[PDB]
Design a protein around this nucleic acid. Structure first.
Ligand SMILES: [K+]
Ligand SMILES: [Mg+2]
Ligand SMILES: [Mg+2]
Ligand SMILES: [Mg+2]
Ligand SMILES: [Mg+2]
Ligand SMILES: [Mg+2]
Ligand SMILES: [Mg+2]
Ligand SMILES: [Mg+2]
Ligand SMILES: [Mg+2]
Ligand SMILES: [Mg+2]
Ligand SMILES: [Mg+2]
Ligand SMILES: [Mg+2]
Ligand SMILES: [Mg+2]
Ligand SMILES: [Mg+2]
Ligand SMILES: [Mg+2]
Ligand SMILES: [Mg+2]
Ligand SMILES: [Mg+2]
Ligand SMILES: [Mg+2]
Ligand SMILES: [Mg+2]
Ligand SMILES: [Mg+2]
Ligand SMILES: [Mg+2]
Ligand SMILES: [Mg+2]
Ligand SMILES: [Mg+2]
Ligand SMILES: [Mg+2]
Ligand SMILES: [Mg+2]
Ligand SMILES: [Mg+2]
Ligand SMILES: [Mg+2]
Ligand SMILES: [Mg+2]
Ligand SMILES: [Mg+2]
Ligand SMILES: [Mg+2]
Ligand SMILES: [Mg+2]
Ligand SMILES: [Mg+2]
Ligand SMILES: [Mg+2]
Ligand SMILES: [Mg+2]
Ligand SMILES: [Mg+2]
Ligand SMILES: [Mg+2]
Ligand SMILES: [Mg+2]
Ligand SMILES: [Mg+2]
Ligand SMILES: [Mg+2]
Ligand SMILES: [Mg+2]
Ligand SMILES: [Mg+2]
Ligand SMILES: [Mg+2]
Ligand SMILES: [Mg+2]
Ligand SMILES: [Mg+2]
Ligand SMILES: [Mg+2]
Ligand SMILES: [Mg+2]
Ligand SMILES: [Mg+2]
Ligand SMILES: [Mg+2]
Ligand SMILES: [Mg+2]
Ligand SMILES: [Mg+2]
Ligand SMILES: [Mg+2]
Ligand SMILES: [Mg+2]
Ligand SMILES: [Mg+2]
Ligand SMILES: [Mg+2]
Ligand SMILES: [Mg+2]
Ligand SMILES: [Mg+2]
Ligand SMILES: [Zn+2]
Lengths: 119, 231, 56, 122, 118
RNA sequence: ACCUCGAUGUCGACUCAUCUCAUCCUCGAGCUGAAGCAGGUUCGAAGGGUUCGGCUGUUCGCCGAUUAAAGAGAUACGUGAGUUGGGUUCAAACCGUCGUGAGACAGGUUGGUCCCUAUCUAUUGUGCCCGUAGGAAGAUUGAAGAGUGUUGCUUCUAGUACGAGAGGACCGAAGCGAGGACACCUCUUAUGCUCCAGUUGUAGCGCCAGCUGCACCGCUGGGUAGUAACGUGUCUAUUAGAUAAACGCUGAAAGCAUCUAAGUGUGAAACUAUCUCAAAGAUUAAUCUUCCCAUUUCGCAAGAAAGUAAGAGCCGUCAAAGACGAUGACGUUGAUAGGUUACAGGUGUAAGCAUAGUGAUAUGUUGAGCUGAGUAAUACUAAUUGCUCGAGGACU
RNA sequence: AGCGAAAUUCCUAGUCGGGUAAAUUCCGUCCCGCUUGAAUGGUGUAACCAUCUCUUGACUGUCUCGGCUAUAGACUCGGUG
RNA sequence: CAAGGAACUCUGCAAAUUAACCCCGUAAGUUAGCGAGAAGGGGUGCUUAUGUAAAAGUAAGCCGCAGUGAAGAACGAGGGG
């Protein structure tokens, strides 16, 4: 069998994580598949804890992950993260995000999951 | 015969340098004090064995029948129970440690459950040969090997029982014999055994007297470093 | 390779004997009462005492 | 680990620049030859002023290996080229000198003449 | 009954570690004195050469020393915390990596490492 | 010329082998024109082993170098719903020869399509249901079985026994290996696609610097955990019983003799065990220990209505496990997973700043910064306050 | 005439020399050429060939000898079938 | 993909080496046209200065294991039908 689809490559996985984490930081909720939310959670928590010092080095580190969204750009998402979201989690020992399971999709029966910022 | 046995958990592998200038790889076994939970006699049972209890746990992590047995026998609650054949000479309810069982450098054998590997093919399982890769080839490259015994009514016409094909590999008991004990650590309750021990790090391990060399004890001593801090 | 003999209507059902379905475990929501499959957010977006999503 | 049909260099004065392995002497299906092993070889690149001629089948012992081997103390000896010296039935070297260093595994398997004629043993 | 496996392995390794264990980087020249034992006595054989790598954590700490005799380059892997072996750092050199593999490809005037390091 | 022409694919090679003994090696013995060493022949013995290459499609065969040995056969001259198509045997073309010719040759040469998703049975693994007569959780014995079994060199015995000499032992002991097998990752290597660093082109972040996408993971040098050998640990022993060939002791039939008829021995890698693994669906369904059942009424009792527990399952977090089941750990009375903290290992002095240089760049802060899985703590997040199944053991 | 064990040689793996540790293939030569041979042409020939055949340097997983990683399948779930 | 490098196989099938530009050098044979990109080698990055219409080049310095740093670029020799 040949002329197969490119597939879930490592680059595709990193880009998928980037898109979901940018969206979850912009809006605050993501309705995705459970196995994708359980992988985006790691990057979300890592970004939030590294964005707690607010130095230019930390901005350069985050910019390798953030992407442009509808509600914020790549530069205003930075201001939202470092001034609104991250300062809230200033003394929380990890676990800033929660993943909960919704019902199965009508056309896939796959388990959906909502990823949210735990207040 | 007079078989001595102890139970422990493998924690990892290291090396030690010894006198006579050898570098000996060793396996480290954390051996908790084992408690003799039962003794079964030849006359009353038709065989003789000793069943110990090890890997102690709190009472809330144990089922009702097992905790009832432990409280009836007046023993420390443990989640692991197993026996060794032909182990005699130990009173019920006595703590046993490998220091009282084996010597400094005697030969022992070790039994442990092998590391699980799952559904493996014929080549990885039975050390079979792989088919040719170049000069033209076919769909089956990692072929198991022709299972033909006889074609025709005057011959077998069937795959012989016990054939060598793909299947489950790993997670199976295996014993390695004639391993020399290297050192005892009373404070850390830590046994050093030469060679490699089967099983993943953290699994259960049974140390028994070697049936090939029951009384043989080959001397082994470590090396004392002569170095001195900077002059 | 193909069957040289036709499989009857009995071997077919014997193979299908293991094709039966299982009833998924269900529970009752603690704020509206409707049945939801266990360990999952209900229809009101109310999981336990936490408002997850806006009401349907 | 020198194997069947392996071209290697000769570290002695005998006129043989390139030598090819024929058999790993010692047993049936002996796969490899480590330091101190004896092999049967054929001279393939020689010189006019040499004791051996091109095409002769002779017996040699290996002294160096690129792969290398590990000793009991844990030291791993590793050279940068596979070398062998031509020996006689008595285990005596055919050449009058040995070029470069040789291993100590020779010492275990006799070969005292080879060690005494070497530049430095390792 | 929590078992810190790494700690127990460290204790077994400490039983036979050495006190000094002098330091050296990748590109360093050291003098290794092998205490070879014959039937009697010891013949201290020096293996001065250039280091190429130092890997390991404890009793399994090993380093690679490269030497050149009669134009033949020989590379030798020692264990740091091994008795009858003495290491004496001679020259400290500057390299930009931890495993300087190119030394087994570059030779002659191009196999000379500049001094100094940080 | 009995089966098959409404099709039984035919040589050789590769992979996997199994069986027989008319035995090539290893093991035991009798005779010898057997001094010793090395042989010859016969008897017993099938447990294991029985090499790599050059030429040829080759089987065969000759030759080279080893080995203890490079055994003889059968299994559709085993094996194409396992591989190949070199050979034979399609269409093309030529040479030699035959034919007036079209054409032909077990004469030669170049080239030339090898399909099938496995229903039953056989086999390798892994499950559900039920039975084992109350239920459940544990620990066992072992009827019937499976796996391995190869062997060399050196030293000593001992230059002793024997032998004019040359040469050169049986028996026994030790050390080191080759092949095969099991397990493991401390060491050496291979790999290590969300790790580190260097670096090219281009497009972006408005520009420099610094990053991101793409170019085989862009390329290159290393590399955590894991997976493996080329790596390192172990095994390939030993012993007992009954024996084959063979040798016996005591002994008659047959006053002698005689291994045999009674009685009593010796005796092989063969056999039965000792070694490893699995095993009570062994329905002939075994044994031991612990725990939980021991209601109110009506009538009908291995009867009803309700009514009584150990345990198990559904669901969730998982990996010492794993195709999916299953196995194993945990589910708030918790460290199961993620996150956080600290550390290990790996990479190799981060960005920024300051100095120096005209600049590329070097130096100091700086063994700095970064880090997928690794080690251990920490309920911060996810394992909810849920549902179902489940017991009085007939009588003899 | 030329060529000759040949795309031709049955006997034949013809003899000898070279190439290899070892060469039914290859190169040169020998000639009882069963049955070579001169326009169905004979013998040579520089260049060329997705032509055939043999030796060789570098090169490599073709192989000693197998091992690891990533995708798409296979495998599990939902839909068509 | 460590060591070996055709030991594999009917056959180096397939795979692997080389690959662009510039500067040296290039045999036997021949129909004198070729052989021939023969074979065999070296350099390529960045900065400063000199060079030019632009260059190319030249001199000095700097960094890396590696400088058409990634993509696209001929493997070769010998004998025979
Ligand atoms: K027919
Ligand atoms: Mg990419
Ligand atoms: Mg095909
Ligand atoms: Mg293929
Ligand atoms: Mg019949
Ligand atoms: Mg039959
Ligand atoms: Mg029906
Ligand atoms: Mg079904
Ligand atoms: Mg008839
Ligand atoms: Mg028939
Ligand atoms: Mg038919
Ligand atoms: Mg048919
Ligand atoms: Mg067929
Ligand atoms: Mg016989
Ligand atoms: Mg036996
Ligand atoms: Mg050849
Ligand atoms: Mg026949
Ligand atoms: Mg056949
Ligand atoms: Mg046959
Ligand atoms: Mg016939
Ligand atoms: Mg078949
Ligand atoms: Mg076939
Ligand atoms: Mg086929
Ligand atoms: Mg068939
Ligand atoms: Mg053909
Ligand atoms: Mg073909
Ligand atoms: Mg034709
Ligand atoms: Mg005619
Ligand atoms: Mg049975
Ligand atoms: Mg390690
Ligand atoms: Mg820039
Ligand atoms: Mg016996
Ligand atoms: Mg008598
Ligand atoms: Mg007997
Ligand atoms: Mg019945
Ligand atoms: Mg964890
Ligand atoms: Mg810096
Ligand atoms: Mg003539
Ligand atoms: Mg002539
Ligand atoms: Mg010919
Ligand atoms: Mg010849
Ligand atoms: Mg041919
Ligand atoms: Mg000729
Ligand atoms: Mg003619
Ligand atoms: Mg004519
Ligand atoms: Mg001609
Ligand atoms: Mg052509
Ligand atoms: Mg897919
Ligand atoms: Mg489906
Ligand atoms: Mg390789
Ligand atoms: Mg090489
Ligand atoms: Mg060949
Ligand atoms: Mg062959
Ligand atoms: Mg090709
Ligand atoms: Mg030419
Ligand atoms: Mg000619
Ligand atoms: Zn609700």
């Amino acid at each position: 069998s040949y002329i197969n689809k490119p597939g879930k490559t490592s680059a595709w996985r990193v880009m998928t994580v980037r898109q979901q984490v940018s969206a979850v930081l912009a809006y605050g909720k993501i309705e995705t598949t459970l196995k994708k939310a359980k992988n985006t959670q790691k990057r979300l928590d890592k970004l939030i804890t590294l964005a707690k010092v607010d130095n230019f080095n930390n901005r350069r580190q985050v910019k390798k992950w953030l992407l442009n969204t509808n509600l914020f750009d790549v530069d205003q998402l930075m201001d939202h993260l470092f001034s609104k979201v991250a300062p809230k989690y200033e003394k929380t020992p990890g676990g800033y995000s929660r993943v909960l399971k919704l019902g199965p999709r009508r056309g896939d029966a796959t388990e959906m999951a909502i990823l949210q910022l735990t207040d | 015969m007079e078989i001595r046995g102890i139970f422990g958990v493998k924690v990892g592998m290291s090396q030690v340098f010894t006198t006579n200038n050898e570098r000996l790889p060793i396996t480290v076994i954390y051996c908790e004090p084992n408690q003799v939970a039962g003794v079964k006699t030849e006359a009353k049972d038709k065989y003789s064995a000793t069943l110990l209890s090890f890997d102690t746990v709190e009472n809330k992590k144990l089922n009702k029948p097992q905790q009832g047995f432990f409280e009836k026998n007046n023993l420390k609650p443990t989640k692991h129970l197993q026996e060794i054949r032909n182990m005699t000479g130990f009173e019920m309810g006595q703590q046993i440690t490998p220091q009282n069982l084996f010597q400094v450098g005697e030969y022992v054998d070790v039994s442990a459950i092998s590391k699980g590997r799952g559904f493996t093919g014929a080549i990885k399982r039975w050390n079979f040969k792989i088919g040719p890769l170049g000069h033209g080839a076919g769909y089956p490259h990692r072929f198991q090997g022709s299972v033909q015994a006889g074609r025709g009514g005057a011959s077998a016409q069937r795959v012989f029982k016990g054939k060598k094909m793909s299947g489950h590999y790993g997670h199976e008991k295996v014993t390695v014999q004639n391993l020399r004990i290297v050192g005892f650590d009373e404070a850390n309750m830590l046994v050093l055994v030469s060679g490699a021990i089967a099983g993943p790090e953290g699994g259960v391990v049974l140390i028994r007297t070697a049936k090939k060399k029951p009384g043989v004890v080959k001397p082994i001593e470590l090396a004392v470093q002569t170095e001195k801090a900077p002059e | 390779a193909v069957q040289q003999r036709r499989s009857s209507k009995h071997r077919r059902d014997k193979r299908r004997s293991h094709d039966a379905l299982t009833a998924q475990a269900l529970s009752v929501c603690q704020k509206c009462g409707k049945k939801k499959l266990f360990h999952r957010v209900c229809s009101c977006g109310m999981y336990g005492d936490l408002r997850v999503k806006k009401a349907y | 680990m020198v194997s069947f049909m392996t071209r290697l260099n000769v570290a002695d004065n005998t006129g043989a620049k390139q030598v090819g392995i024929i058999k790993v002497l010692g047993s049936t299906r002996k796969r490899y030859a480590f330091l101190g092993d004896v092999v049967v070889v054929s001279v393939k690149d020689a010189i006019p002023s040499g004791m051996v001629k091109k095409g002769q089948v002779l017996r040699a012992v290996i002294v160096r290996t690129k792969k290398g081997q590990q000793r009991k103390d844990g030291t791993h000896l590793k050279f940068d080229d596979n070398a062998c010296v031509l020996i006689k039935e008595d285990k005596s070297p055919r050449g009058t000198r040995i070029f470069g260093p040789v291993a100590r595994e020779l010492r275990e398997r006799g070969y005292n003449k080879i060690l005494s004629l070497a530049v430095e043993v390792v | 009954k929590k078992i810190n496996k790494q700690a127990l392995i460290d204790l077994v390794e400490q039983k036979q570690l050495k006190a000094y264990v002098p330091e050296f980087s990748a590109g360093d020249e050291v003098n290794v004195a092998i205490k070879l034992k014959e039937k009697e006595k010891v013949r201290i054989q020096n293996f001065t050469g250039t280091v190429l790598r130092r890997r390991g954590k404890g009793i399994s700490e090993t380093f690679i020393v490269r030497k050149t005799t009669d134009g033949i380059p020989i590379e030798k892997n020692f264990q740091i915390h091994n008795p009858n072996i003495s290491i004496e750092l001679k020259r400290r050199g500057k390299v930009r990596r931890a495993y300087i593999s190119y030394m087994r490809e570059r030779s002659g005037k191009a196999a000379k490492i500049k001094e100094r390091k940080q």
